[PDB]
């Protein structure tokens, strides 16, 4: 009575509409639910035929999207097309696996299928390009040219989500793009800090350092992943502090006596904040305080 071939003809258009990010309706969605359950139950080979049809449609749409994406030879155009297409694809991959709950139970495999297909289609070939473009955009942003944050956020979340390695969810992401981010940020502060310190002054350097620390914190909160914070944000601002304040701790302790004999409130707040970061930085200013005591 009920077989895969008797209803797959009606099944396919709704699957394609869900896949290709098109407008859909609730009633058709519930009819699709009932149809997939009935085909999974009655037909002896119904689940297998459903799975192979799903994989065929997934592969076809992934090939179409990949062909569209590779059309843009320009790096920035390719980046914007890739982020738009990935956002729509990821919304679909969040929506798509819900109908095939009966298929999943009998044998989510659908979400893994989508993620792996998109990965092996596009990510495996343009991961390096996306990475370098992301660092270029983020370093331009840190220079003072604000850009579209959603692009870098989507790049990062594609890195965290499309990790084929099942040992850790964010293994490839954390051990490639996160460490590249730390190295890039460290080199930017290494290039920038001595010039500002030598030119603008001392208290100017401290206030600029505080402002840049706040900006780096907010950019770590927004750009860098915060769903799990797996040694990412902590490593980022730890490298920031060990590249700025641990770097110029000699200047800080040199001016510590001047602060002690001059009673700067902002500098006091700064060193109170920075005792915790330095593993053994407490002793300079506390010994200066006791020299005041003695």
């Amino acid at each position: 009575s009920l077989q895969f071939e008797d209803k797959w003809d009606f099944m396919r258009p709704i699957v394609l509409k869900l896949l290709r990010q098109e407008s859909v309706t609730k009633q058709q969605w519930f009819d699709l639910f009932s149809d997939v359950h009935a085909v999974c139950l009655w037909d002896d080979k119904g689940p297998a035929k459903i799975h192979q049809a799903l994989k065929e449609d997934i592969l076809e749409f992934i090939k179409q999207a990949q062909a569209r994406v590779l059309s843009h030879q320009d790096d920035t155009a390719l980046l914007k097309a890739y982020i738009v297409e990935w956002r729509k694809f990821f919304t679909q991959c969040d929506i798509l696996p819900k109908p095939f709950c009966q298929l999943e139970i009998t044998l989510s495999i659908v979400r893994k299928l989508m993620l792996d297909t998109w990965n092996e289609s596009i990510f495996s070939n343009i991961k390096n390009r996306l990475q370098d473009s992301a660092m270029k955009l983020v370093h331009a942003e840190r220079l003072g040219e604000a850009f579209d944050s959603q692009l870098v956020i989507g790049v990062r979340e594609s890195y965290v989500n499309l990790c084929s390695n099942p040992e850790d969810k964010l293994q490839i992401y954390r051990d490639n793009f996160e460490k590249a981010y730390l190295d890039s940020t460290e080199r930017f502060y290494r290039t920038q800090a001595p010039s500002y310190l030598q030119q603008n002054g001392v208290q100017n350097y401290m206030k600029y350092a505080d402002a840049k620390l706040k900006e780096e914190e907010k950019r770590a909160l927004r750009y860098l992943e915060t769903r799990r914070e797996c040694n990412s944000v902590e490593a980022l601002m730890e490298c920031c502090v060990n590249a700025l304040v641990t770097s110029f701790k000699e200047t800080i302790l040199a001016e510590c006596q001047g602060m002690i004999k001059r009673n700067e409130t902002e500098k006091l707040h700064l060193m109170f904040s920075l005792m915790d970061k330095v593993p053994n930085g407490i002793e300079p200013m506390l010994k200066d305080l006791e020299e005041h005591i003695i």
């Binding site: 609730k26 969605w29 929506i95 819900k98 109908p99 709950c101 009966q102």
Partner: protein, 87 residues
Amino acid sequence: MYVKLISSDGHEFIVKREHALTSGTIKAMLSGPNEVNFREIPSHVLSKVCMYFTYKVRYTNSSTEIPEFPIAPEIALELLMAANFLD
């Protein structure tokens, strides 16, 4: 906050939200693109399904003594079909 479960004929079996989410397929059905349509599930099955939903949500922690669920064999096969779809 209730969920409206429209049966095949058109009967509405509106049930408290927290009861309906005991079945996985309902949870997956509400998500994505209230109103839920059950054309294969008629009154003499959906009524007992929602009634079992209430019975299960209340008699699930009471380890003292849980009374059984007497249901007639005249609807038992259709009830198994509904429990295979929803649950």
